[PDB]
Amino acid sequence: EEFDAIKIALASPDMIRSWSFGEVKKPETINYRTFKPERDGLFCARIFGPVKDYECLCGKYKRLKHRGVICEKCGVEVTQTKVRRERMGHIELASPTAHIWFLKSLPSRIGLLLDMPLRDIERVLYFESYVVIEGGMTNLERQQILTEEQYLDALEEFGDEFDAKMGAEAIQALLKSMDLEQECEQLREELNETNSETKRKKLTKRIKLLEAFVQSGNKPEWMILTVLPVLPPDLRPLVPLDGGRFATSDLNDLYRRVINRNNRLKRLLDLAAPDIIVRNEKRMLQEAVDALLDNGRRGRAITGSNKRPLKSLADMIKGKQGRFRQNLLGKRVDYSGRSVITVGPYLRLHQCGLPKKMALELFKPFIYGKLELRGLATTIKAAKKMVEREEAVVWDILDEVIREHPVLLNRAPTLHRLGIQAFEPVLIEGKAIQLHPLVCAAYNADFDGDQMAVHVPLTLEAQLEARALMMSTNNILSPANGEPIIVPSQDVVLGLYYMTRDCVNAKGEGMVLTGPKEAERLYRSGLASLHARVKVRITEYEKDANGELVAKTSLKDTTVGRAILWMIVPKGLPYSIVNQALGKKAISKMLNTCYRILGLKPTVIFADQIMYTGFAYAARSGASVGIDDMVIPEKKHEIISEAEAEVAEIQEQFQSGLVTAGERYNKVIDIWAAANDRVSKAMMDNLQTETVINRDGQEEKQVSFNSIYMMADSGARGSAAQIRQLAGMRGLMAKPDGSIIETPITANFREGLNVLQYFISTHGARKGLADTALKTANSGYLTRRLVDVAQDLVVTEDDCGTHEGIMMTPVIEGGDVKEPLRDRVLGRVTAEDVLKPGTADILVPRNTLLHEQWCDLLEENSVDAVKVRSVVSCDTDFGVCAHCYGRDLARGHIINKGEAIGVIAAQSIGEPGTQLSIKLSNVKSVVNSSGKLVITSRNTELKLIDEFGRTKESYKVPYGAVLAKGDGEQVAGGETVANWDPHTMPVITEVSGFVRFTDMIDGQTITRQTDELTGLSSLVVLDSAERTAGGKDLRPALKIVDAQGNDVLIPGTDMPAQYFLPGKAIVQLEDGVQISSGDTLARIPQGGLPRVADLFEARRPKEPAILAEISGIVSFGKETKGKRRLVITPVDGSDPYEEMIPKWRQLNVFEGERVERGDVISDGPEAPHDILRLRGVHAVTRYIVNEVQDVYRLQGVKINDKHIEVIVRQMLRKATIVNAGSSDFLEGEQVEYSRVKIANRELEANGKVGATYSRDLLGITKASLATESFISAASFQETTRVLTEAAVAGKRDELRGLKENVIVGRLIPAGTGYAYHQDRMRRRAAG
Amino acid sequence: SAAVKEFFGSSQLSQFMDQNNPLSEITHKRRISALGPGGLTRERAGFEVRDVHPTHYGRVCPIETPEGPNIGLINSLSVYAQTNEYGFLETPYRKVTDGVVTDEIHYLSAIEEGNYVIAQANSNLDEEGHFVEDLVTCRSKGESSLFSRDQVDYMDVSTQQVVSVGASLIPFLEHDDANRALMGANMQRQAVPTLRADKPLVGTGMERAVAVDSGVTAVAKRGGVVQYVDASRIVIKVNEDEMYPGEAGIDIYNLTKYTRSNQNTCINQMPCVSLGEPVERGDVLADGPSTDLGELALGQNMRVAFMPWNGYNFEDSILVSERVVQEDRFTTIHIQELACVSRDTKL
Amino acid sequence: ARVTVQDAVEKIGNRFDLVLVAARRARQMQVGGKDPLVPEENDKTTVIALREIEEGLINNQILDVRERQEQQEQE
Amino acid sequence: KSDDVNGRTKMYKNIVDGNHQMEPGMPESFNVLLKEIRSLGINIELEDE
DNA sequence: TATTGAATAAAATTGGGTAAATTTGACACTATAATGGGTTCGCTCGTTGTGGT
DNA sequence: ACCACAACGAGTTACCTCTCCAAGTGTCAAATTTACCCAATTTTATTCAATA
RNA sequence: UGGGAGAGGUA
């Protein structure tokens, strides 16, 4: 009721006896003659409590007159039976036994506490080898594990000088005899002498364990159990079945085994049994206690009579069906119904059809309250029988209760937050819920058998939250992107498309109408068609520079249907949004424009009116599907016969042996793909424009009124690929191993397939239908991982006050602009001003929310780089500030402080998983005698700066690719200057002169062989592996000299112009030839959802990419191995840093040029830990954001970038200590970055040195498990490991996260609970 | 008794029989499961075994399987498929001899049909002789290609050879995409039998085969004339040529009336023959739950229209007239059993 | 204020504080035994409180000084 | 609406009395979880500040 | 004229203990020869923890 | 130091529907309660008188 | 009382 934190620790034996209420001695659960539990058993009423409320066992004190007495006939305290599920017991184990968690939860922590192997410790516990504890002689140091032979001969040697034991008593004696602070100071001494990182990490792990034990204040001998506690017997009930027999519980069976073996060990110990028998009984008691605590951990699980393993206490805590995830994070809930959903096409956006019987069951205590308020019922039983007989006044009171009382409709799986919404219920007859058609896109609902759950908010605060937050008219925009989720779908779309679409000579063409009301009159009277091109007088409105609307009137040229749609378009929008054929994209753009111009309420009314007129005019259209609507082009037989002639020609060409199988089959694939796209183009043309037979100007072409084409072109339901399968060709199908078949399905679904084509199509059909299920499971697990990594992130500040930011840029990857800067920056907050002379010298202020007005300002002033405050650079501790987040994408304004942006971002990322002039920069170029610009650097790239100040094209030119144009000139359209050698790279020079083959001897470093393909006797180099004894010292360095022989000197340095050419490189030019500055001498030849899960999991690639750790000149340190060695030394400081690169990976940047910080020296995909620790937090965020958005844009989904930035900010919470300051952060340990920042804040405040750190990119699972809330980490995953580590360290959860406050059952610190939580924080901080 | 009762009661393959309609019973009896004791395991299996192998042709249906997590693991037998003496599946084929497609029917296993070259079922003939073209389409070694009329070794015995029973009851199956054909073949087994069964206007010809082979009707054992028809008893006087010389020549057919099925539906047999009519050996005398004159009848013929109607058919929804409800066209009887057992408490 | 709460939201500034203030006012109107400042027009106390916030008679500081004033009257 | 045994009866009588206000307490499933982690030999306890 | 600070019997309550009733767990009941056992593999992917050159 | 093996854990959300899961009876030492004895304390009434 | 498995199905 009043409690702040939750602490976890080990349990002392006195504490285990302190929670207990009586020792359990006998293993009998209950007597089976009469249903009465036996004394000192597992259900004993003298220990745990009476089985009836205020009644003793033998029936002596049955009334509440004796509110508690110990009945001397049966020892039972006469109290309530609620204490049966709250009173524990205990069992006093004869021999002490090891706890299975603190033994076999790796790392073992007993072996880590004692620096003993777990194999040796289990050898001791299994009574196989003795271990010494103390010794007066020097021959037996501590923990020297002896066998039985060594124990017996040491017993004959010394006898009483030492004392070696066995079993868990020996390990308890070791843990009791060890000295914690002495081992702490000894380990802190021994930390300095070692230098290997593995041994150092072992020493830091042991010293962290010892310091955690000392700082917690537990004792290490409490890891060995001497008292075992018993669960209360109403938390492990004996459920009776329908046969009279019982299905007894697994905990009762495991406690029965433990008690039986403990009692037999007591009898054998006081009976003076032999040592072998008593050791077997001790080992069996150890196995039984270990089975009860965690069955499947140590050996083979003890299975029941039904051949199923028994559920242990750990099995009841952990897992999906365990306590956290099944009964604490999600519960079953009263006042809740469930039914199949139907359409509500008459409803409004806030309404839902609720059945009367469903609502009468859901709202029954409200009905009883209204009945006893109106006086119609005398008591609760009279009201109950009145509702049971369902009077007309009961239905009237239900109609009164239902009004202005919202309910929550929810459809599983709730992937994003719009899977629960609030509606005002409408009482209907029938048994199905009526859902509004415009919310089915946000629900992902259809009406093929979907069900939804209803929930009734009870309290006034819950009703106000449903009305003000979760109402369907309150979330028109998405939380992921700013786009509206209320888009009309397919029937509204078909109706408005048929409405707005024109025709050339329909009926009543060329009239002049007074207005839209006369157009509606003409259409309803039948004197004009919907598509008659006509002239009406449209009075349209426009918002001025102020908020007032100015009117204007003109004679527009339009159709009748657009005039009728203008009757429901609100006042403030132009006629240009109505004056074209409206598809799905056009209607969504019209709704978004109405939002941005008018607000929320006219947008909701407009969406309702759009739905009504779209439904009505789709009904009046009478659109259908016939077999004559899928028109096949008549040239399908000719194209198919030409392709068959091509395959027959290449078949006899293969029979001639001229063409081989691989390129033959590739050419067959190309022939059939060419025929496929040709017949698809013919089908699309014939379906699209065959309606030509017209009049009144001539016979003229127009857009076809084929209904299949209308459903495709409107974007209602369909696309050109499905129309191609319907009417053209089915296409090339694939074998299940990912290979395209040689022949395609040349039939379609109108003509029907044969048996072979159908059997060929079933492979891809069943493959896609398995992939849908597998991707729902994978996307659900990814969404859960994301929610748990980002659960505790809440906006807890208004402005953190930073100058850090992210340099935003329009992504111009490939050959086009992918995302413009306007939507890349829209809604953000600028880190600083924009600074340019430019075309306007625009100075936006610092910390401005970029609206559409500022986006248009930056567009008209031609800006390309804006620095905006991101989430990963926020200065706030334990949360972010509102300015660093920016605009709330669901409401359109800035984010309110107290909004769970981590849960919003995790749901936004995990929801579409089911859908899953020339400019040169960074150049080091050389110009030869012909001016031919061949590049010799590696990270060189080109840009196309426009005539206004924006880049519009990006190409990274490879090392050795050739370019003709220079810089400064204007580019030409179509002039593709970018050409290359797509199979080899050169080793081009930079100093002209006559080449002298120096620093090489023929035979040991270079192979003398005349090339058989060119004929000229050219000198070839050989690999460093097969060299002689004279090849183990020097490397082949092509020291290029000038014409007279001596080496030239490069200006800026003094090193000789020599370059180590690598092995297996054919050199064609010999001595005595002329070289240029930039010509070569050797040419060496060369899923989406799992990709997103790998990017978020920080999984290193299968082939990494080695980067340059330090800037400087690169050399070599060790040869004569495939796993070679590279040294990279700076020009200023020393470097003993050597790497280890195998020879089967190629090498990019040679050992003669000076490299920069963190550039690629071995190509391949980059690792994000390397990107972080070599370039920065900004670079790793840009890499992860770009690489996830590439997947989400390749599948055509629009997610904002701040959500991925929120997840990366949650991924970067840990900072390893590289050097200590004055604080108690020692060396190489991982701690939270906010703790380091707070310690450095206070140390630089009071005048200390402060500690230095290095941030670490944890994975999503590892960060969720390494958060500092053990309750949240345990409810996520690995409850055994997390609770074991938290019990050893003695942690405490301060209940600062949403998962922790949900498990505990309080108000979360987000939303409406945020004010209450900061009030509670100031109350517990002030006083 | 413990072993055989444990197996037959609570094995993983001893399953509560689906008997919504006769199609569900026949498909549950013709089911093949990759799971079970010593088979695969459901969560621990991937796309390698959930695929359609090219040896499944004529043995295992590619378009009748569930669409949940049991998709490639629970399969259906094809129509003509048999087993070896060892238990391997085999399918019949017609043997050609010098181009002449004979009536020689050979049941080939999957290892024998890769050696030969088998012509497709949709290749034309003349006088039950040669092929009317010279380059017919065939399949060898799992792949398909063109072959000459004298190169061919075998030919498929029918055109319903690949599909199962429920995928053969779908008319115009070759115009349906395989996803929706799979869903329709699955949803045919969930159809409840109605008050008055109605034969489909567009069927296939497998309707009579399912309605007789399902065992849900009451076929005649011997041919003769019908002597007495009640609503619960049909008496047939056997013809003399089909009569054993020692018996009376009278067959009694007691019918089941209003018996609860496993899915709490209705099972009742209604006599389809009249008084005095002659029947032959193999003639349907009483209809089943969802049969009609010995033809399988799972639903009703509805005059349908394809148009949007005011949003009342928005996203797969269906707008229904009132004649459907007044004429009791989809009115189903659902028998349901409730037991009250007076136990023996100790009070 | 029955369909949307946008006018009350632009009055207050935050939907969470709107929920808390309107819940306080609806508690006073429901079980506190008070009378509304707007005509109720047969509405529930939730929607009456939201209409009062939309009109501009109920705010957090308004409820606070009203509670302090009635506290000084009752003492 | 769930495992608060002394809170849901209060909520039911409050709804019948026309008072739409709850008095929540600790979940009995959280008490069950505390008892099971205590039975595993691990002393977890709520901390009164 | 009265109510109450100090003082005092004095019996009830707390705490400790203690010898006698009384449970409580075990054991009796018994002798041709016998001497070492039955129980899961067609899951993947990844991660972390252990041992040789 | 780096590689090659064992063990844990995880795998969407609900929803449903079914079935299935031998006989007390007499004896012994110990330990356990139990009715009870008695000082220390302290709670409650009761006397003296002495301010008011 | 109302638990746990196994099987099947729906979105």
Ligand SMILES: [Mg+2]
């Ligand atoms: Mg659906």
Ligand SMILES: [Zn+2]
């Ligand atoms: Zn009693």
Ligand SMILES: [Zn+2]
């Ligand atoms: Zn900030």
